[PDB]
């Protein structure tokens, strides 16, 4: 008897839902009087499954109404922890621990990627005689990002970027950048939100109307 | 024996399919053979405690691996990474240690519209007209249903083409034009039938300077 993990690492996007698995030998059928499943992370209990039931009282405050153990999977020899709406606090080392005659644990590490991939934009005519426009790009993510404006002819341009803490998601940043430029209908520009360590670029295409 | 007969697998993910066999004592890997195939193409040939990767078919060159730490437990776990629609079919496993026996496992590949890209364009701030867009790929064809925070169905413009990335899939992009203000919430729902399946992104109208 030993627990096995088909996936050692999980990379999961902010706000989405994850299923992290642990597999254990089940020759015949589950004797739920003998079955225990314990999920935790950084010494905080997520799930304690005993005598066929989830002990939700011992569940840590953080995970209330978010985490649960898929029970259809238990019959197959698979203890699947599903957590919904992944925060940046859910980055950590997750211990899964099962006792069924023998008893053994495995580790699973989770990283939470919070990309600047929901990009909002605005294009305004500031002065139609000089055909000066104001382009704007906003997005949210973690950590801080810089905005990089480029034209269709690959010219870097000077934008004005304003980084604040997000009024939606406490831990994320709200990055808004503004480009003033002279241009005409159908010309194409790009704003590119750049995170670092490791580098990651998300880019939206603005079409001047 | 096989705990799971049927696997429903996501497109582009990893799958782990399992065949169990009796193991009273420990593994003499000179005596052990494991063979995995689908449609007479070899996926894995494991012999003398080593993967015989020259017999492997082109299709599975660096994708197919046998989880070696789970051989110790009496369970041959075929793992294939980056699942295409071509991986739908019937997989045979055979193992010979002392005795010999085979099991068949059916695999179906779902390609859900669960990676939804979004963007919000402020068209005219005077009227406060915004242009919300959602796009995704999947199979089969899916409709998009736009709804407001109080769940009224709104009129949209949806465009469906064959995907350029993977031509068997479809690209579904939908745009909604609506007069609205900062912090109002909208939903774009990718729906697909026989059987029904819903995936929805939540779009929040931003505060721009």
Residue numbers in the entry:
A (entry chain B): 19 to 227
B (entry chain A): 22 to 230
What text does the study give?
The PD-1/PD-L1 immune checkpoint, which is one of the best characterized receptor ligands in immuno-oncology, involves PD-1 (programmed death protein 1, also known as CD279) and two known ligands PD-L1 (B7-H1; CD274) and PD-L2 (B7-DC; CD273). The binding of PD-1 to its PD-L1 ligand limits T-cell activity, thereby preventing excessive stimulation and maintaining immune tolerance to self-antigens. Here, we have screened and identified a specific high-affinity PD-L1 nanobody (single domain antibody), designated KN035, which shows strong antitumor activity comparable to that of durvalumab, a fully humanized antibody developed by AstraZeneca showing promising readouts in multiple phase III clinical trials. To further investigate the molecular mechanism underlying the PD-L1/KN035 interaction, we solved crystal structures of KN035 complexed with an (IgV) N-terminal immunoglobulin-variable domain of PD-L1 at 1.7 Å resolution and with free PD-L1 at 2.7 Å resolution.
The binding of KN035 induces minor main chain conformational changes in PD-L1 when compared with the free PD-L1 structure solved here or to previous structures of PD-L1. The connecting loop linking strands C’ and D of PD-L1 has shifted ~7.5 Å, which is likely caused by crystal packing. Overall, these findings indicate that the binding surface of PD-L1 is relatively rigid. Furthermore, the sidechains of these residues in the KN035/PD-L1 complex largely adopt similar conformations as observed in the free form of PD-L1 structures solved here or previously published. The limited sidechain conformational change during complex formation likely consumes little free energy and favors tight binding.
